[PDB]
Chains A and B, each alone.
Chain A
Amino acid sequence: MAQNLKDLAGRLPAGPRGMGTALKLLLGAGAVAYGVRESVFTVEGGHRAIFFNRIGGVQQDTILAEGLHFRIPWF
């Protein structure tokens, strides 16, 4: 299966310089959009989805009444 991906990636036409940087920028934008989408969490109302601070445990003082609160991914 790895060799098939090898051939598929290789077969991409050797286009002029512009589209290479274009593809790099597109990948950057895709990753950034994915991160922005993921920074919000499963949220039902009737659930004060509080900030679980990574350090020190739960945020005993950060009591999330009804309101945006972006979870730092992996944090």
Chain B
Amino acid sequence: MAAKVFESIGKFGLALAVAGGVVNSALYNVDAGHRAVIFDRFRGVQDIVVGEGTHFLIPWVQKPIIFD
């Protein structure tokens, strides 16, 4: 019984670490005075002005380019 608990806790910890890494990679800091532009490569550069604001950029799609 103990070994199963060990393995399950390890799997949960690994999943939590992966999720935390993804969440951290999904955020950006475009300092103010720099209004950001979403660097979305799905459907492009957002006429919807996503300026300053750490909007949740999905990884592999939206890299924060900092526009001053």
Binding site for B on A (CB under 8 A): 2-3, 5-7, 9-12, 14, 52, 54, 74
Closest chain-A Cβ to B58's Cβ sits at a distance in Å of 17
Residue B6 lies at the interface, judged by CB distance under 8 Å to chain A: yes
**A6 near B2 (CB under 8 angstroms)?**
no
**B9 near A9 (CB under 8 angstroms)?**
yes
**B5 near A14 (CB under 8 angstroms)?**
yes
Residue B17 lies at the interface, judged by CB distance under 8 Å to chain A: yes
Residue B10 lies at the interface, judged by CB distance under 8 Å to chain A: yes
**B6 near A10 (CB under 8 angstroms)?**
yes
Binding site for A on B (CB under 8 A): 2, 5-7, 9-11, 13-14, 17-18, 32, 52-54
**A6 near B11 (CB under 8 angstroms)?**
yes
A-B contact count (CB 8 A): 32
- The interface residues of chain B, by DSSP majority, are classed as helix
Take A14-B2, A14-B5 as given contacts and tell me if A7 and B32 are in contact as well, using a CB distance cutoff of 8 Å: no
Contact of B7 among A5, A10, A12, A74 (CB under 8 A): A10
Chain A residue nearest to B55 (CB atoms) is A74
Q: Which residues of B contact A3 (CB under 8 A)?
A: 10, 14
Q: With the chains together, A54 CA to B17 CA distance in Å? A: 30
Most B CB contacts (10 A, CB to CB) among A2, A10, A74 go to A10
Take A9-B9, A9-B10 as given contacts and tell me if A2 and B2 are in contact as well, using a CB distance cutoff of 8 Å: no
